[PDB]
Design an enzyme around this catalytic site. Structure first.
Site, PDB file in Angstrom:
ATOM      1  N   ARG A   1       4.075  11.038   4.098  1.00  9.18           N
ATOM      2  CA  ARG A   1       3.593  10.300   2.953  1.00  9.18           C
ATOM      3  C   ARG A   1       2.432  11.003   2.346  1.00  9.18           C
ATOM      4  O   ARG A   1       1.528  11.417   3.051  1.00  9.18           O
ATOM      5  CB  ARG A   1       3.192   8.873   3.343  1.00  9.18           C
ATOM      6  CG  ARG A   1       4.321   8.098   4.004  1.00  9.18           C
ATOM      7  CD  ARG A   1       3.913   6.655   4.360  1.00  9.18           C
ATOM      8  NE  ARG A   1       2.853   6.636   5.349  1.00  9.18           N
ATOM      9  CZ  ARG A   1       2.280   5.533   5.805  1.00  9.18           C
ATOM     10  NH1 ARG A   1       2.736   4.339   5.478  1.00  9.18           N
ATOM     11  NH2 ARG A   1       1.232   5.641   6.578  1.00  9.18           N
TER      12      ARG A   1
ATOM     13  N   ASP B   1       0.798  -1.263   0.000  1.00 12.54           N
ATOM     14  CA  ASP B   1       0.000   0.000   0.000  1.00 12.54           C
ATOM     15  C   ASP B   1       0.824   1.305   0.000  1.00 12.54           C
ATOM     16  O   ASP B   1       0.263   2.355   0.212  1.00 12.54           O
ATOM     17  CB  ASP B   1      -1.057  -0.002   1.148  1.00 12.54           C
ATOM     18  CG  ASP B   1      -0.432  -0.248   2.501  1.00 12.54           C
ATOM     19  OD1 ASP B   1       0.753   0.138   2.673  1.00 12.54           O
ATOM     20  OD2 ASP B   1      -1.099  -0.857   3.327  1.00 12.54           O
TER      21      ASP B   1
ATOM     22  N   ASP C   1      -5.752  -1.152   3.859  1.00 15.79           N
ATOM     23  CA  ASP C   1      -4.628  -1.728   4.571  1.00 15.79           C
ATOM     24  C   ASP C   1      -4.333  -3.059   3.952  1.00 15.79           C
ATOM     25  O   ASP C   1      -5.180  -3.929   3.847  1.00 15.79           O
ATOM     26  CB  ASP C   1      -4.974  -1.836   6.033  1.00 15.79           C
ATOM     27  CG  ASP C   1      -3.716  -2.116   6.907  1.00 15.79           C
ATOM     28  OD1 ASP C   1      -2.671  -1.575   6.574  1.00 15.79           O
ATOM     29  OD2 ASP C   1      -3.954  -2.774   7.892  1.00 15.79           O
ATOM     30  N   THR C   2      -3.090  -3.227   3.502  1.00 18.46           N
ATOM     31  CA  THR C   2      -2.595  -4.531   3.075  1.00 18.46           C
ATOM     32  C   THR C   2      -1.749  -5.175   4.151  1.00 18.46           C
ATOM     33  O   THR C   2      -1.216  -4.508   5.025  1.00 18.46           O
ATOM     34  CB  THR C   2      -1.708  -4.392   1.829  1.00 18.46           C
ATOM     35  OG1 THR C   2      -0.619  -3.478   2.048  1.00 18.46           O
ATOM     36  CG2 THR C   2      -2.481  -3.916   0.542  1.00 18.46           C
TER      37      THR C   2
ATOM     38  N   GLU D   1       1.424  -6.749   5.983  1.00 18.72           N
ATOM     39  CA  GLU D   1       2.839  -6.403   5.882  1.00 18.72           C
ATOM     40  C   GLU D   1       3.547  -7.548   5.121  1.00 18.72           C
ATOM     41  O   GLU D   1       3.011  -8.677   5.034  1.00 18.72           O
ATOM     42  CB  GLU D   1       3.435  -6.147   7.280  1.00 18.72           C
ATOM     43  CG  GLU D   1       2.779  -4.954   7.996  1.00 18.72           C
ATOM     44  CD  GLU D   1       3.107  -3.604   7.346  1.00 18.72           C
ATOM     45  OE1 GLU D   1       4.240  -3.499   6.831  1.00 18.72           O
ATOM     46  OE2 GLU D   1       2.272  -2.628   7.365  1.00 18.72           O
TER      47      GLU D   1
ATOM     48  N   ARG E   1       1.015   6.771   0.313  1.00 23.07           N
ATOM     49  CA  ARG E   1       0.240   5.710   1.004  1.00 23.07           C
ATOM     50  C   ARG E   1      -1.181   5.738   0.466  1.00 23.07           C
ATOM     51  O   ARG E   1      -1.780   6.784   0.347  1.00 23.07           O
ATOM     52  CB  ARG E   1       0.194   6.041   2.502  1.00 23.07           C
ATOM     53  CG  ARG E   1      -0.586   5.128   3.406  1.00 23.07           C
ATOM     54  CD  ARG E   1      -0.112   3.703   3.407  1.00 23.07           C
ATOM     55  NE  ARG E   1      -0.745   2.905   4.468  1.00 23.07           N
ATOM     56  CZ  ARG E   1      -1.956   2.322   4.383  1.00 23.07           C
ATOM     57  NH1 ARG E   1      -2.727   2.488   3.325  1.00 23.07           N
ATOM     58  NH2 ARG E   1      -2.415   1.584   5.416  1.00 23.07           N
TER      59      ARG E   1
END
Ligand SMILES: Cc1cn([C@H]2C[C@H](OP(=O)(O)O)[C@@H](COP(=O)(O)O)O2)c(=O)[nH]c1=O
Ligand SMILES: [Ca+2]
Length: 129
Positions: free
Chosen positions: A75, A15, A34-35, A37, A29
């Site tokens: 970001r 992401d 949310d992906t 980790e 970002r």
């Protein structure tokens, strides 16, 4: 909301990505997702999916929402498109990201993404398998 140009500098993970935007290198970002980790289940597959989509694109674009454009880490916060296809939505539709981090006033594409998530979950794809 408006799409603006950028060029890929480097894939990072599921992401985040390094793009050149208005001629300056920045990490972006993805909004509203949310992906996992890289170390967690479906992390590698999310990263790979994102990397392929963005490196195969002829044209990358960034679309800021109405609110904050950079987060506390500096970001950029945007929706990212690869040849007109929204990366944020594609990751969700594939079961490779969850809708997350939905803050009031930067949530224009929330419902679009939740619909994608529902379709992924119904199909039992990836994270929802
Ligand atoms: C996606 C997003 C994350 N963030 C911050 C919240 C989280 O803070 P914390 O680092 O304190 O948990 C972090 C999640 O990003 P990552 O999922 O990349 O770690 O980024 C924002 O402030 N705005 C956003 O729109
Ligand atoms: Ca993450």
């Amino acid at each position: 909301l408006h799409k603006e140009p950028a060029t890929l500098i480097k894939a990072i993970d599921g992401d985040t990505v390094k793009l050149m935007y208005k001629g300056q290198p920045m990490t972006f970002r993805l909004l509203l997702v949310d992906t996992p980790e890289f170390n967690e289940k479906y992390g590698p597959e999310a990263s790979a999916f994102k990397k392929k989509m963005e490196e195969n694109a002829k044209k990358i674009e960034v679309e800021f929402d109405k609110g904050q454009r950079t987060d506390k880490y500096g970001r950029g916060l945007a929706y990212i498109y690869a040849d007109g296809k929204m990366v944020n939505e594609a990751l969700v539709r594939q079961g490779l990201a969850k809708v997350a981090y939905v803050y009031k006033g930067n949530n224009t594409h929330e419902q679009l993404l939740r619909k994608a998530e529902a379709q992924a979950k119904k199909e039992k794809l990836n994270i929802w398998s």
